[PDB]
Design a protein around this ligand. Structure first.
Ligand SMILES: CC(C)=CCC/C(C)=C\COP(=O)(O)OP(=O)(O)O
Length: 306
């Protein structure tokens, strides 16, 4: 009843404080709780996906929390704007989540916030048995022109089906999360040519071996130019040692987080999603530790972590 529901949200907040504390990061409750409360239904429903994510380098003092939201709830961006939890940008990115649902089957939403800066992003998931390609995404009027402008490039590298998108309202950026990646797409020669053609940081062999393991690859695009801002390779695993860095500080920090981050499906091993992010000037690493998982993550582990 009402007690147990309120306690579930409190438990999620306490887990988020714990995860942030592994980084030395303090949590602002009056920034986080209104957002959690706004989406308390989704946190008690039980098909919940909740991830607490950290990053290396200049992003090392941030903790992001991502929470799935069913489409039955209605567009989550409209909710956060109408409740005053985020100021509308006045930019096409405001329209894009709604526009996407207007044009394509969306199977689920998600939101993302940071413990210090509050709400930052929304996600649109497509059904796994019915994902769009680049051409269908380009039919959405509020999609950045950059998506269509990079269509020939995406096709040349085998970046075809998109499992989900994300919208970053503060940076006015979109991520396309490509799925069903061929082995040719992820071989070293392909990844190198892609990264070089985009003008991004060239990885070393440790990074390339990580890339070969990827289950998802996501470029970031914007509405100002057709240049991709950065490119990320994602690896899902129960292995806590996979951060693709030779720096001992990174190796220790990520293993620490991967073995201590809170989660509620105790009796299983933690689901981890690692990221290798390449921008024009730098490489950096990400690690989301899932607090709540579903069959989707378990299936990805079976397919990609066996
Ligand atoms: C609820 C679910 C399954 C959502 C996944 C959220 C997540 C932490 C990964 C997506 O990349 P990102 O949003 O961290 O990318 P970027 O760093 O470019 O914002």
């Amino acid at each position: 009843g009402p007690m147990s529901e309120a306690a579930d949200v409190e438990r999620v907040y306490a887990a988020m404080e714990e995860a942030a504390g592994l980084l030395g990061v303090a949590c602002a409750r009056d920034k986080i709780y209104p957002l959690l409360s706004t989406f308390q239904d989704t946190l008690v429903e039980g098909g919940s996906v909740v991830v607490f994510s950290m990053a290396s380098g200049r992003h090392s003092t941030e903790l992001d929390f991502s929470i799935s939201v069913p489409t039955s709830h209605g567009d989550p961006y409209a909710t956060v704007v109408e409740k005053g939890l985020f100021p509308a940008t006045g930019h096409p990115v405001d329209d894009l989540l709604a526009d996407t649902q207007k044009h394509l089957p969306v199977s689920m939403f998600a939101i993302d916030g940071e413990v210090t800066g509050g709400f930052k992003k929304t996600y649109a998931f497509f059904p796994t048995d019915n994902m769009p390609g680049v051409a269908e995404l380009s039919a959405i009027p509020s999609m950045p022109p950059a998506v269509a402008e990079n269509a020939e490039l995406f096709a040349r590298y085998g970046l075809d089906k998109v499992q989900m998108t994300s919208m970053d309202y503060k940076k006015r950026q979109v991520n396309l999360y490509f799925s069903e990646l061929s082995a040719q797409t992820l071989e070293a020669e392909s990844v190198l040519a892609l990264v070089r053609e985009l003008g991004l940081h060239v990885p070393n062999e440790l990074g390339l071996k990580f890339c070969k393991r990827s289950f998802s690859v996501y470029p970031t695009l914007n509405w100002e130019t057709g240049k991709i801002d950065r490119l990320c390779f994602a690896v899902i695993s129960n292995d806590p040692t996979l951060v693709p860095s030779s720096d001992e500080g990174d190796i220790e920090k990520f293993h620490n987080y991967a073995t201590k981050a809170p989660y509620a499906y105790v009796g299983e091993k933690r689901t981890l999603v690692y990221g290798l992010t390449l921008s024009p000037k730098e490489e950096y690493y990400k690690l989301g530790a899932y607090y709540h998982i579903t069959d989707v993550q378990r299936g990805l582990l079976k397919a990609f972590d066996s």
